Amino acid sequence: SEESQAFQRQLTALIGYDVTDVSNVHDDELEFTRRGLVTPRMAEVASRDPKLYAMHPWVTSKPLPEYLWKKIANNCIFIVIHRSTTSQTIKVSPDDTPGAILQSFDFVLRVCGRDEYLVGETPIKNFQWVRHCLKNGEEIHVVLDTPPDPALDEVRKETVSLWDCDRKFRVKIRGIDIPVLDLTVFVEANIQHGQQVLCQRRTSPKPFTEEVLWNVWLEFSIKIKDLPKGALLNLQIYCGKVQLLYYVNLLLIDHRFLLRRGEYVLHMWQISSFNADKLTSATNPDKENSMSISILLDNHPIALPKHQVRAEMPNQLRKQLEAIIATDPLNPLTAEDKELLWHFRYESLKHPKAYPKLFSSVKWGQQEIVAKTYQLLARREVWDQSALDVGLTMQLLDCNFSDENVRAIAVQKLESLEDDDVLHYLLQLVQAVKFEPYHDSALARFLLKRGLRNKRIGHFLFWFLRSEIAQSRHYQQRFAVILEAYLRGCGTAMLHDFTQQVQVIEMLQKVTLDIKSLSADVSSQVISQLKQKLENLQNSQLPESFRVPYDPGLKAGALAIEKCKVMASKKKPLWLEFKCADPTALSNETIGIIFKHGDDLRQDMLILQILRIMESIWETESLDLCLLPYGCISTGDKIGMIEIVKDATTIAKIQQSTVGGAFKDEVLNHWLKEKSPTEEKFQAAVERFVYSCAGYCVATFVLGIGDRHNDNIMITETGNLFHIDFGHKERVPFVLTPDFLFVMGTSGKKTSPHFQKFQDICVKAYLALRHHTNLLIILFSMMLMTGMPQLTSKEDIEYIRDALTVGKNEEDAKKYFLDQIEVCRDKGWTVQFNWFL
Ligand SMILES: N#CCNc1ncnc(-n2c(Nc3cccc(O)c3)nc3ccccc32)n1
């Protein structure tokens, strides 16, 4: 192929991994998957409306909430339209379509300052930019523009059956080899499906030298016909109480439905226990330093075939079944429970909420049972007609399920998600790719086609996939195949966008890392050295304008060198500021970004996303708790960017300026007054604080991250509180300190008008989250598994069960949470003071 040479290396520098490389494979799954994704790519590319794809209108079909109607005066909003020098203002009703305003004044209404458009058949109240304005109380400024050319979006032109085999499965362990290393060592071989271990065998313990041989057949009790698709041979290495040092995995049935055969020399992963890294079919790329195991699967090709009633039951049984279905997802199922669910299979099928539990009662090491299960899936009318529950759907995409048909019925439910909701779960859906047994899956193809069908989903998919590719040896190959698949259909315009973005951050990360080296306080020298490189970059070869990765609407321009600094933190992050590249912008506020190496911003990404989910949960119940979940992208290993929230300082530094060093109550409130221009704006600031505080109180308690040092809480000059830095004796539920309480109007032990309102919001916020207990549990589980490097135990996850008081009735839980506030009215500054040491 000709010009494809430069285009492929163009893709490689965008992805940050060579997709064509074959040095770290032992089959053709990755390449098969590239070829496999061509069709779903072509199918989506060819069927999208070229023009709607260009203006990417960001819209929603949810009701406009209670808290936003009371903002509209007399069923009429104001839209300032802009010509050249001066503007004109028009009055419009919440239902007026973009078209119904094109007459009153072919042209298109682009937002002032942003690459966002108001086009297409949706009411203007249904546009997100509008709901943003209304929320913060801001004027809607648009410009009369020419529609962007769809030509810019142009895409570059492009035999023995298994069930006839009653033989027992066997695998030969030749031995383990390690280039460099006193105990004994054995190998453990597990047949696995999900995380259920079907069969297990061990070798005898040999002395741990740099090469160990066994040459033994481990005969299993499971038969070849009884092996289900997606079953992992999991080979582990222990020494010796025993300890696990190395693990590795191999799919027994391959992507062609063929039983795995022949010689394999698999390089293995180390340890430092539920962790998504432990499930991967990928092998260690580090050939020179890693341990390896050598095996033989001896066996005509043995292909796996593709598959082509009671409802009357006793009283106490039906109730026992419903008690089982009405438990949380973390509640374990006994043998008796499982045996019950399977027998009444068909009664269970009528309840969508039974599905996780029901498919966790299947004996996957039994061909005739799985056969009955597939027949059971062929009759899923009730599931098919049910309204989409994301939390139930999530459950079926986690580590406990490895059956493609089971997982496909979940991915079926996600199809009905409007693009606004995909964005709400995209991060967690992307991470859920780690639980897929195979590189080609419904879930992967779903992400692929939702990204090709939408520039916004497409933008965030890019960085989400890129984040993991840059810092996951366990999953970089898989995500890389998917990302390439996406880029080969996103269109020339975006490819060029992505190139600028990659080039800018790769440049700025260098400057971030160089500066960190040069410090042992913001010393005289460093100040000028940073400004040295930042003026070096302004001409060669930083493109004059790039999209903000955490806010794809915003074009950033030239560095405001004067305003850039290194910060007085121990990790020396950058404080960078940019002119807005758009001359049609009506502000002059710079775009502030922090670049930081040192923290794990993947954890920050996840926690932030969950916060956005809690916000939308509250929207369903007409609540707004004014959380500030700022942009944060993980660009690499322990490195990324953060949005600078304008006009904000930490709590501790407010306590520093009055004292310097503990601790005074009124400080905050008289800091608040000295930033309010009126008195009206001051009480609005007290109001924003009442909600803000309550918001982070509820959210952090549930997540178990409420007990925090107070230079990790921030506030804006308009009262908006918010936590930061989510990287990683006697305790406290959350941070309700006596200075917070003084703002609400209380001093010691009283109930002020504002403090009641606080308790009012908290209680409602908490119980609102409890209406989504299941969903939060799964999100939280998934987060711990794909985002925390901690070999997360059951006990780490069982925290949120307690926090959300599962089982407890509505009344009893409200009093449980009010106990919590009262424990904050017991320690005051004692926990804060303890940090100081
Ligand atoms: N005006 C204004 C300030 N605006 C602002 N907005 C967001 N963050 C910060 N900020 C973060 N951010 C952060 C750092 C690591 C992780 C993470 O999640 C957030 N660290 C900080 C340390 C000292 C001071 C501010 C910090 N500031």
Structure tokens at 451: 């990204």
Q: Known binder of ligand: residue 796?
A: no
Instruction: Report residue 348: phi and psi, to 5°.
Output: -70, -35
HSE, CB side, 13 Å, CA atoms: give it for residue 67: 17
- Which residue CA neighbors atom 13 of ligand 1 most closely? 725
Q: 3-state secondary structure string, 329-373? A: CCCCCCHHHHHHHHHCHHHHCCCHHHHHHHHCCCCCCCHHHHHHH
Ligand 1 site, residue 705, Cβ cutoff 6 A: no
Q: What is the DSSP string of 207-242?
A: E--SEEEEEEEEEEEEEGGGPPTT-EEEEEEEE---
Structure tokens at 622: 């007409």
Residue 176: strand pairing partners: 212, 293
Ligand 1 site, residue 725, Cβ cutoff 6 A: yes
362 burial type by CB count under 10 A (0-12 exposed, 13-18 middle, 19+ buried)? buried
Ligand 1 site, residue 155, Cβ cutoff 6 A: no
Sheet of 648-650: strands edge to edge?
648-650, 713-716, 721-723
- Which residue CA neighbors atom 14 of ligand 1 most closely? 725
Ligand 1 site, residue 650, Cβ cutoff 6 A: yes
Q: Known binder of ligand: residue 592?
A: yes
Ligand 1 center from residue 633 Cα (angstroms): 13
CA 220 to each of CA 204, 244, 431, 580: distance values in angstroms, whole numbers, following the listed order: 16, 22, 33, 65
Instruction: Report residue 575: phi and psi, to 5°.
Output: -115, 90
- Residue written as token pair 């997540």: 703
Method: X-ray
Ligand 1 site, residue 418, Cβ cutoff 6 A: no
Q: Known binder of ligand: residue 631?
A: yes
Ligand 1 center from residue 720 Cα (angstroms): 14
**Going by C-beta distance under 8 Å and a sequence separation of 6 or more, which residues neighbour residue 479?**
433, 465, 468, 469, 472
Instruction: Report residue 595: phi and psi, to 5°.
Output: -105, 125
Ligand 1 center from residue 502 Cα (angstroms): 23
Ligand 1 center from residue 638 Cα (angstroms): 16
Ligand 1 site, residue 407, Cβ cutoff 6 A: no
Q: Give the relative orientation of helices 810-827 and 753-770 as an angle to the nearest 10 degrees.
A: 130
Q: Within a 10 A sphere around the Cβ of 640, how many other Cβ atoms? A: 29
For residue 809, the 8-state DSSP code is: -
Q: Known binder of ligand: residue 543?
A: no
39 burial type by CB count under 10 A (0-12 exposed, 13-18 middle, 19+ buried)? exposed
Q: Known binder of ligand: residue 601?
A: yes
174 SS3 class: strand
- For residue 383, give the nearest of 421, 361, 360, 356 by alpha carbon: 356
Ligand 1 center from residue 442 Cα (angstroms): 38
For residues 373 and 199, is the Cβ–Cβ distance under 8 A? no
- Which residue CA neighbors atom 8 of ligand 1 most closely? 644
Q: Known binder of ligand: residue 222?
A: no
Ligand 1 site, residue 589, Cβ cutoff 6 A: no
Tell me the best of 572, 601, 602, 714 to mutate to test the pocket of ligand 1, counting ligand atoms within 8 Å of each CB and taking the most: 714
CA 122 to each of CA 57, 94, 556: distance values in angstroms, whole numbers, following the listed order: 10, 10, 29
CATH numbers and ranges of domains, the chain: 1-158 (3.10.20.90), 164-300 (2.60.40.150), 301-491 (1.25.40.70), 492-646 (3.30.1010.10), 647-833 (1.10.1070.11)
Ligand 1 site, residue 632, Cβ cutoff 6 A: yes
For residues 180, 184, 187, 190, the Cα torsion angle rounded to the nearest 10 degrees is -130
**Going by C-beta distance under 8 Å and a sequence separation of 6 or more, which residues neighbour residue 69?**
none
Ligand 1 center from residue 642 Cα (angstroms): 7
CA 480 to each of CA 10, 209, 462, 469, 634: distance values in angstroms, whole numbers, following the listed order: 14, 37, 10, 7, 16
- Which residue CA neighbors atom 2 of ligand 1 most closely? 648
Cα–Cα distance, 437 to 515 (Å, whole number): 42
Ligand 1 site, residue 651, Cβ cutoff 6 A: no
**Going by C-beta distance under 8 Å and a sequence separation of 6 or more, which residues neighbour residue 434?**
276, 279, 280, 474, 475, 786
Question: Count of residues for the chain?
Answer: 837
Where is 149: in which H helix or E strand? Answer: none
For residues 710 and 716, is the Cβ–Cβ distance under 8 A? no
Tell me the best of 564, 572, 594, 656 to mutate to test the pocket of ligand 1, counting ligand atoms within 8 Å of each CB and taking the most: 594
Asked whether the bond before 820 is cis by omega within 30 degrees of 0, the reply is no
Where is 101: in which H helix or E strand? Answer: helix 99-102
- Residue written as token pair 């285009």: 7
Structure tokens at 621: 């119940």
Ligand 1 center from residue 648 Cα (angstroms): 9
Q: Give the relative orientation of helices 29-47 and 442-452 as an angle to the nearest 10 degrees.
A: 40
Q: What is the DSSP string of 743-807?
A: HHT--SS---HHHHHHHHHHHHHHHHHHTTHHHHHHHHHHHHHHH--S-B-HHHHHHHHHHTTSS
For residues 657 and 649, is the Cβ–Cβ distance under 8 A? no
Ligand 1 site, residue 726, Cβ cutoff 6 A: yes
Q: For residue 727, give the ligand 1 atom closest to its CA.
A: 16
Q: Known binder of ligand: residue 657?
A: no
Ligand 1 center from residue 392 Cα (angstroms): 35
Ligand 1 center from residue 631 Cα (angstroms): 11
- Residue written as token pair 């040896």: 473
Ligand 1 site, residue 594, Cβ cutoff 6 A: yes
216 burial type by CB count under 10 A (0-12 exposed, 13-18 middle, 19+ buried)? middle
Q: Known binder of ligand: residue 632?
A: yes
Ligand 1 center from residue 409 Cα (angstroms): 42
Q: Known binder of ligand: residue 516?
A: no
Ligand 1 center from residue 181 Cα (angstroms): 43
Cα–Cα distance, 167 to 222 (Å, whole number): 9
Ligand 1 site, residue 608, Cβ cutoff 6 A: no
Ligand 1 center from residue 454 Cα (angstroms): 31
CA 369 to each of CA 85, 275, 321, 400: distance values in angstroms, whole numbers, following the listed order: 74, 29, 20, 18
Ligand 1 site, residue 52, Cβ cutoff 6 A: no
For residues 373 and 359, is the Cβ–Cβ distance under 8 A? yes
What sign results for the dihedral spanned by CA atoms 83, 84, 88, 91?
positive
